[PDB]
Every structure is written in C-alpha cells, then in structure tokens.
C-alpha cells in the first residue's frame, strides 16, 4: 500500500503467474517466451472509486505499471508485449477490487 510512482503516492497487487501470450506469429511468440520473465508480475492500481468503470481503472493500471517497471533494457517491442500481459493482469486485479468494493 501507499506506493509512489512519478511523485504521486496512494498507489496500491499480489504477484500473479505470468501466462503465455499468443500473438498469432511465430517470431512474436518466440520473442515473448524468451523475454516474458523480464516483464511485471504485479500491477499498480488505485482504489476503484477513483474511476467510472473498468476501462479507466485498467488504463491507469497498465500505464503506471509499465512506467514503474521501465523507469526502474526495454525496447518498443517490449513495451507492446508488456501492454498485452499487463492488461490481462489489470483486468484480473479490477475484478478482485470490484468484488471487494461491492462487498
């Protein structure tokens, strides 16, 4: 809790298994298999009440998780692949937080 990214605090997830992402292309699949452990397995997010819906929560979660990971060598290909796997984890995280919020 209470994590700071880019000078803003109040960010909050537990580690998740990184799954394989299936890109529909042999080279991308092989590159992902080679590099997937360099990518995050925990996502940064903010409380669900700070968003209107899942899409906006997930947008921040993807953006900030990747920024935190890349500012703390990643190419543009790495960023694009991180966007795919981190989006899935952020969706999972949103469902966890949403269920807790509606209780």
């Amino acid at each position, epitope marked *: 809790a209470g994590a700071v990214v880019g000078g*803003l605090g109040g960010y909050m997830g537990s580690a998740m298994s990184r799954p394989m992402i299936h890109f529909g292309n042999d080279w991308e699949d092989r590159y992902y298999r080679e590099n997937m452990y360099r990518y995050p397995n925990q996502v940064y997010y903010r409380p669900v009440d*700070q*968003y*209107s819906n899942q899409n906006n929560f997930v947008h*921040d979660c993807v953006n900030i998780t990747i920024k935190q990971h890349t500012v703390t060598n990643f190419t543009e290909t790495d960023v694009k692949m991180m966007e795919r796997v981190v989006e899935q984890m952020c969706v999972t995280q949103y469902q966890k937080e949403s269920q807790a919020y509606y209780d």
Partner: nanobody
Amino acid sequence: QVQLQESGGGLVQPGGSLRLSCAASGRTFSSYNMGWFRQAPGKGREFVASITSSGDKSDYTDSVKGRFTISRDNAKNTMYLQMNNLKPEDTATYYCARGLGIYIIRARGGYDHWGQGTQVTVSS
C-alpha cells in the same frame, strides 16, 4: 499557489456545442499537468480529459473521444474544453484540477486543487 476557476457552461441543445474555460492564478500554470472531471447528479467526480503541462499530450475517457477536445494556452494561464455533439449523458458539473506527479492519469486521485465547478445542462 496555482488555483483554478471554471467559466462557461449553461444550457446546450443535443448535438450542439459549447466551450468551458479554466482560469489559473499564480505564476506556474505552464508547469502543471491539468485535467477535467465531471460529476453527474448523485455520482462522484469522474475523468473527462487531461493534458500535459506543455500541451503536447492529451487523454480522454472513451465516451467523449472525438467529441470533446482539451487544450491550453500557457501564455494566458487558461485551459479549455471544447464540447461538441452534446448528448443528454453529458449533463453534469464540470471541474478542472491540477495534476499530481509527473504522469497524467484518469483516477480522481491523480489531481487536486479542484475548482468550484461549472454546470452544463443538455436541454430536454
């Protein structure tokens, strides 16, 4: 020391347009990322659009993309929201706010120094 106050608003017909402004005090408006939020009756403030300090990057909630345009005039210490193709769902109090930290985000917690707000009503 940068504080904010919205102007513009009022009534607009469905499909019409209007422009909101957000005037800033102090000397460093041009160093702040900025955002617009809106609060519909009985709801909390939720993201509409944001713009970086330089004006070079902007972001929008999906339901306003292509209809609303955020902009700023650093020389005049003001940010704008041009609202086109207004829909009944757009009726709300609109607030401007100063960005916290270096990254524009969509969360309500990414901004502070909220203006007092201005009202937009789509006619019915």
